[PDB]
Structure formats: C-alpha cells, structure tokens
C-alpha cells in the first residue's frame, strides 16, 4: 500500500488545518481508517468503511474526520487548534477490517498500514 499526505506545518491558534491522505493499491472503500499523533503515538480520529461511524479521542468538537471513497482519500479537518495539538500526525488504515469497534479502535495495532508522519506545529 502507498500513501500520499498533504497539509501540515505551522499554524497559529483557533486556526485550522486540513490533513489529506490518499491510499493505494488497496480497496479503500472497504477499509477502516484512523488518524494518530505522537510526541508521546495515540489515537486521534477514526472512521469506518461507509463513513457512518466515526470515533474521536481531547479533540472532540474540534477535529472531524472524513473520507471520499471515489478518490481513495481520508481527511482530518482540525479546528480551534491549541499548542497541545502540536505533534507528528500519521494516517493509518486497515486492509483487513472495514469497521473496528470497541477498545480495539484506538490500538495502533488494529491498523496494518501507515503513512509517514507530518509535523503539525501550533504556535502561541
């Protein structure tokens, strides 16, 4: 599996970023996706194959996760950014599970493919 990410870098506060991740070759429309972040590597957001079920970590009401199966893309829209959100953000996926529910949702081990991280740094 190949991943391509866009978005990241420095943003101020109360300001926002959009992280985007394209995936292939895999069946993306069939895959559970998630976003993780590090400092210090934990679960941020996650979304099932049909995007009718989503989970969030500290980030609730700010970050929203999205996907377009047409493009094999998953998104993280981050709003109201605070300095504590500074981390390296990784997009994760499972070519195995379409939906991961319960505790296992947040285990990095539930996801078998990973994008390289992007530094997101929110200044005071």
């Amino acid at each position: 599996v190949q991943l391509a990410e866009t978005g990241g870098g420095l943003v101020q506060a109360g300001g926002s970023l959009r992280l985007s991740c394209a995936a292939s070759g895999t069946t993306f429309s069939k895959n559970a996706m998630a976003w993780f972040r590090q400092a210090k590597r934990e679960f941020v957001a996650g979304i099932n194959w049909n995007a009718v079920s989503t989970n969030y970590a500290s980030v609730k009401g700010r970050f929203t996760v999205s996907r377009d199966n047409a493009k094999n893309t998953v998104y993280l829209q981050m709003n109201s950014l605070k300095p504590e959100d500074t981390a390296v953000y990784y997009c994760a996926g499972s070519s195995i599970y379409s939906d991961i529910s319960g505790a296992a949702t947040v285990w990095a081990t539930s996801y078998n493919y990973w994008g390289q991280g992007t530094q997101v740094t929110v200044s005071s």
Partner: peptide
Amino acid sequence: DVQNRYTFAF
C-alpha cells in the same frame, strides 16, 4: 457483550 468488535473488509 464482547469487548472488541471487528468487521472484515471481505
């Protein structure tokens, strides 16, 4: 009542 619930992609 299971702790973890998985749906396969297949």
